[PDB]
Design a protein around this ligand. Sequence first.
Ligand code: NAP
Ligand code: ZST
Length: 315
Amino acid sequence: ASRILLNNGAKMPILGLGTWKSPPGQVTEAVKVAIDVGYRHIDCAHIYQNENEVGVAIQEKLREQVVKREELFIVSKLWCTYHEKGLVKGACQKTLSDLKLDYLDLYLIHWPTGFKPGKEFFPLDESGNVVPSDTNILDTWAAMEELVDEGLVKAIGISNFNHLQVEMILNKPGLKYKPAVNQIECHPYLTQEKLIQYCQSKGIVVTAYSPLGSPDRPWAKPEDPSLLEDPRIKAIAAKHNKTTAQVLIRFPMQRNLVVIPKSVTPERIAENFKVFDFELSSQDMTTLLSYNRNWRVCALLSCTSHKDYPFHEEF
Ligand SMILES: NC(=O)c1ccc[n+]([C@@H]2O[C@H](COP(=O)([O-])OP(=O)(O)OC[C@H]3O[C@@H](n4cnc5c(N)ncnc54)[C@H](OP(=O)(O)O)[C@@H]3O)[C@@H](O)[C@H]2O)c1
Ligand SMILES: O=C(O)Cc1nn(Cc2nc3cc(C(F)(F)F)ccc3s2)c(=O)c2ccccc12
């Protein structure tokens, strides 16, 4: 089955296309190809600074009558510099304008940390610390709720929230919408068992990002572990006559997760979608979960003093 039921009654495709680090010079082509081979879910963000070019590709394929808007599941995220309640609608509408859409299927608080408002996306002080804003999770969530009620977005959720942060929202007195999705890093080196169990037990759908271990993350170090190059995973893949990437994508699908692998290479975009024709065994699943090492590609150290830094907590 290709989609998962959200708590707003909408269905979300469990396989989507990631766009972080896709240059504007290629994401337009990536999205056109992805739509052509079956992708219906695109994961976007203002901070990826390519939303216009994603937009160009969606609009053209609608025009080309390849797909209808209702068939598409378009996701974007509120960046940290816009957590002030007065700044949220504006940030959402900028994304909508860039994407040439009149609604988003899902809009996420990108990170639980608010940053000092301004032009700069990562404001740092003279000594390299991120400059926080005096905003809090709940007031930001309230502002996300207004976007639903104004029809700009069909569902709202969070990303990179620990279970206590998620709980803050669930337990909010006067809560209008429960989060639909929590999008978190997840792969065989960071298996997220406790956070996944929590979220699923609250009927919050989990999206796994960086499922291939983000080998193009800009701060990669040669000594870092490399999922696509792990000979153990390569061995599972060889056994199924699939690539290592296909195995890494299928793995979260069998944990009832949504997964959003990124590529701008047309051959890989196609390859990555071809994962509904095979099953990983119970042993394969057990084996892949045993590789957990609590290793994160996304965890900017200049943020570790923010009051809302999410990764001090065990989960
Ligand atoms: N919520 C958040 O905080 C957050 C954080 C990080 C990521 N995400 C989202 O999750 C998406 C996926 O994560 P990610 O971009 O970090 O990394 P990823 O999807 O784990 O890996 C993308 C890297 O894998 C390569 N790749 C893709 N398919 C391949 C294949 N079949 N064989 C070999 N290499 C392949 C890509 O190369 P080419 O593109 O050059 O083909 C690129 O270098 C992002 O794009 C973004 O949409 C969200
Ligand atoms: O954001 C993307 O989608 C990918 C992403 N991840 N990271 C690593 C980060 N680590 C963080 C940690 C916190 C923290 F909450 F923990 F404080 C807050 C914010 C961040 S950004 C980046 O630095 C980044 C820069 C530009 C575009 C995308 C990204």
